[PDB]
């Protein structure tokens, strides 16, 4: 004002120091993809074989557990189906969530 | 003269011009930033979605078994302090006072409704006190007696005993262990 | 016998796929759990970084908005060279944020509070008893714009009302 | 259950929100009913459940907003009818409608905002109705009640 | 995972599981006699940890598995786009700090 006339180098380089503080925000950005994308690659490879074992359930044990009764007999289904007229006529709340619905 | 005003011309004109152009391109960069962030957390809905599966009946089984061996302690007969730590592992190290003397007082504090009332909490806290005295000799053996153990035997064995606190009793067992010569 | 194979291979399926895949999701989705916390708080502070895109790539683009608002002004069609406030207003509001770096440091207000635009330096000069040559008490050296605060900040750990050996710089020798 | 939503505006209380004892069995029953494909049906039923319940709680606050009780006192004259709180709990139960409805998903499902149309398009017609009511008690005379219209503007 | 801690006795607060902590220990064993008559109900609560524990164990590994596919797949593609966006940010302060010291160097020439 009365003597501050050279303010371009100091307020603008201070704004470049703020841009150096925003270069520290680029350290927060390289740090952002660094920490976040590091969690991405780390959890990604960490749980891909978890999708191979959940896939081992979800492919092999899935249709294996489906084709358990690929051939299964005639009278026994009447027997245990009648035992699901035992258990399915116990209500829902006695029986329970995947108890009832999985008997369905 | 117009050398200085040439610094005003190139510096002010190019600075304002490429300031707006580069900062507007930076605004397009921020558009890509919130783009990838929105697709990122939107892809991170499966994180919480799978993360509801923390079925803490494990906590009911370590807690139910904690009630069980707690009742083994609460028969005034919890002599299951394998000697005396148990040695080199009871959680990973000396945890006979860590998981159990803190369960002798904190499970002396475990009052369901009446649940072996304060006749039992006192002497159960005296099992916290006997295992606390042997704990004092234990971390005293860890760091105060060794005093030569630059390794984890002072460090991560008393710091394995860092569920027990009050390490200025160990500094008291440094004016009585390492400044005991002093 | 195929029902015996259902007991063996399917008890392996439910029991061993449930227990083994229970280890896969337990340990591996525990790594997805804690690493989900890592990308979770990383997503939160990443949203703070997106806020920094507003706090720096828009705030210095607001400085650029005044800049190309002045080259957009360009009102010579030479005395319109006062194209910055942040030559005065945000430069003594940044230097009055050095009256907030001052007012934080205190660093006058206490009772001078006039002009420390460049509160230009602070040092740690443990002073000397000038006669005997022995040391005196310590003193922060607060060299402001136009006044000196040679303040013993001991045991005045603030920097609110520290011991102000003070005078103005225009006759400081 | 029904209740005056003004009681959750007087006491400012948080709005009802169902929870996971249901919701695990609910979404389970849904995709369970996408193996059965009748999740559309029980979905439309559920539009029934919460839509009618908004007709219940929002049947409480039909009273103080069908009637703008300040007709021509000065003309306007108080700024103080109850179409404000009507539209307030209308939007806030639109909000917990939005969340609590659009929670329960295997994430990609088409009709989730179409569900929101199924629940709220009748309530769009409810606001259009009471919008009609205050639209005609504030009618037929500028400065009837003519400034008070601006709060209607507020509401719209 | 999330197990094998010390936990003894964190949240002292005996949790009254089937109220077996309340019934045997806290209503028939009030003054430290029992838990010996109640210790039988504690081992019975361990069998109840095998039947309650087996019951929750059935529901433990039950919700599976379709698919969380683009968790991994969008983790991959969004990780590569995260790499390219990180190139946009390092490029952003590259050209940005290049201009900052550029016209702060011509502004140092204004100094």
Curated annotation (Swiss-Prot), chain A:
It is found in: Cytoplasmic vesicle, Secretory vesicle; Bud; Bud neck. Involved in the secretory pathway as part of the exocyst complex which tethers secretory vesicles to the sites of exocytosis. Plays a role in the assembly of the exocyst. Belongs to the EXO70 family. The exocyst complex is composed of SEC3, SEC5, SEC6, SEC8, SEC10, SEC15, EXO70 and EXO84. Interacts with RHO3. Present with 4280 molecules/cell in log phase SD medium. This is Exocyst complex component EXO70.
UniProtKB/Swiss-Prot annotation, chain B:
The modification Phosphoserine is found at residue 45. It comes from the Eukaryota. The exocyst complex is composed of SEC3, SEC5, SEC6, SEC8, SEC10, SEC15, EXO70 and EXO84. Belongs to the SEC10 family. Present with 2340 molecules/cell in log phase SD medium. Component of the exocyst complex involved in the docking of exocytic vesicles with fusion sites on the plasma membrane. This is Exocyst complex component SEC10.
Curated annotation (Swiss-Prot), chain C:
Residues 26-77 form a coiled coil. There is a cross-link at residue 18 (Glycyl lysine isopeptide (Lys-Gly) (interchain with G-Cter in ubiquitin)). It is found in: Cytoplasmic vesicle, Secretory vesicle; Bud; Bud neck. Component of the exocyst complex composed of SEC3, SEC5, SEC6, SEC8, SEC10, SEC15, EXO70 and EXO84. Also interacts with SNP1. Involved in the secretory pathway as part of the exocyst complex which tethers secretory vesicles to the sites of exocytosis. Plays a role in both the assembly of the exocyst and the polarization of this complex to specific sites of the plasma membrane for exocytosis and to the budding site. Also involved in assembly of the spliceosome. Belongs to the EXO84 family. This is Exocyst complex component EXO84. The gene is EXO84.
Swiss-Prot record, chain E:
It is found in: Cytoplasm; Cell membrane. Component of the exocyst complex involved in the docking of exocytic vesicles with fusion sites on the plasma membrane. It comes from the Eukaryota. The chain holds residues 42 to 152 of 910 of the full protein. The exocyst complex is composed of SEC3, SEC5, SEC6, SEC8, SEC10, SEC15, EXO70 and EXO84. Interacts with SEC4. Belongs to the SEC15 family. Present with 4280 molecules/cell in log phase SD medium. Residues 47-75 form a coiled coil. This is Exocyst complex component SEC15.
């Amino acid at each position: 004002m009365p003597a501050e006339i050279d303010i371009d180098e100091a307020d603008v380089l201070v704004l470049s120091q703020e841009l150096q503080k925003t270069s520290k925000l680029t350290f927060e950005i390289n740090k952002s993809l660094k920490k976040i994308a590091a969690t991405s690659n780390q959890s990604s490879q960490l749980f891909t074989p978890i999708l191979a074992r959940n896939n081992v359930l979800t492919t092999l044990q899935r249709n294996i557990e489906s084709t358990l009764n690929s051939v299964a007999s005639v009278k026994d289904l009447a027997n245990e189906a009648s035992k699901y007229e035992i258990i399915l006529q116990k209500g829902i709340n006695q029986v329970g969530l995947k108890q009832y619905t999985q008997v369905v | 003269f117009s050398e200085q005003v040439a610094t005003q011309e190139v510096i002010h004109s190019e600075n304002v011009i490429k300031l707006s152009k580069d900062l507007h391109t930076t605004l397009l960069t921020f558009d890509k930033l919130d783009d990838r962030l929105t697709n990122v957390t939107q892809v991170v809905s499966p994180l919480g979605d799978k993360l509801e599966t923390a079925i803490k009946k494990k906590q009911n089984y370590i807690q139910s078994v904690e009630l069980i061996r707690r009742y083994n302690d609460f028969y005034s007969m919890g002599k299951s302090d394998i000697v005396e730590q148990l040695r080199l592992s009871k959680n990973w190290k000396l945890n006979l006072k860590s998981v159990k003397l803190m369960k002798n007082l904190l499970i002396l504090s475990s009052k369901l409704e009446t649940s072996s009332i304060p006749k039992t909490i006192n002497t159960k806290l005296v099992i916290e006190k006997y295992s606390e005295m042997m704990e004092n000799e234990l971390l005293e053996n860890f760091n105060s007696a060794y005093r030569e153990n630059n390794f984890t035997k002072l460090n991560e064995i008393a710091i394995i005993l860092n569920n027990f606190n009050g390490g200025v009793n160990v500094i008291q067992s440094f004016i009585n262990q390492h400044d005991y010569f002093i | 016998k195929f029902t015996s194979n259902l007991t063996d291979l399917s008890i392996q399926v439910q029991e061993e796929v449930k227990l083994n895949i229970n280890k896969s999701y337990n340990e591996i989705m525990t790594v997805n759990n804690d690493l989900n916390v890592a990308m979770l708080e990383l997503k939160r502070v990443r949203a703070n970084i997106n806020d920094l895109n507003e706090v720096l790539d828009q705030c210095t683009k607001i400085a650029e908005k005044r800049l190309q608002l002045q080259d957009q002004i360009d009102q010579e069609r030479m005395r319109r060279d006062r194209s910055s406030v942040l030559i005065l207003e945000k430069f003594w509001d940044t230097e009055l944020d050095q009256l907030f770096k001052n007012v934080e440091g205190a660093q006058k207000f206490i009772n001078s509070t006039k002009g420390r635009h460049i509160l230009m330096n602070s040092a740690n000069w443990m002073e000397l008893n000038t006669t005997t040559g022995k040391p005196l008490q310590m003193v922060q050296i607060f060299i402001l714009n136009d006044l000196v605060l040679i303040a013993d900040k001991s045991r005045d750990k603030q920097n609110d009302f520290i011991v102000s050996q003070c005078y103005p710089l225009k006759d400081v020798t | 259950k029904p209740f005056d939503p003004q009681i959750n505006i007087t006491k400012k209380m948080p709005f009802p929100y169902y929870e996971d004892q249901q919701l695990g069995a609910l979404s389970w029953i849904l995709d369970y009913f996408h193996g059965n494909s009748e999740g559309s049906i029980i979905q439309d039923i559920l539009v029934g459940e919460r839509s009618k319940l908004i007709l219940k709680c929002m049947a409480f606050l039909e009273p103080f907003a069908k009637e703008i009780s300040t007709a021509k006192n000065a003309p306007y004259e108080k700024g103080s009818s109850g179409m404000n709180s009507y539209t307030e709990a209308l939007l806030g139960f639109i909000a917990n409608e939005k969340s609590l409805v659009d929670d329960l998903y295997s994430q990609y499902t088409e009709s989730k905002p179409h569900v929101l149309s199924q629940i709220l398009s009748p309530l769009i017609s409810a606001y259009a109705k009471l919008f009609g009511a205050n639209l005609k008690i504030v009618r037929s005379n500028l400065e009837n009640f003519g400034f008070f219209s601006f709060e209607l503007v507020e509401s719209i | 995972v999330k197990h094998e801690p010390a936990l003894g006795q964190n949240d002292v607060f005996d949790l009254d599981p089937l109220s077996f902590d309340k019934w045997v220990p806290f209503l028939r064993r009030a003054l430290d006699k029992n838990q010996l008559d109640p210790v039988i109900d504690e081992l019975e609560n361990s069998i109840e940890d095998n039947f309650q524990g087996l019951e929750l164990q059935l529901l433990q590994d039950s919700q599976m598995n379709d698919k969380l596919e683009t968790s991994i797949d969008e983790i991959a593609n969004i990780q590569g786009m995260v790499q390219d966006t990180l190139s946009s940010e390092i490029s952003k302060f590259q050209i940005r700090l290049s201009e900052s010291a550029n016209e702060l160097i011509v502004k140092k020439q204004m100094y």
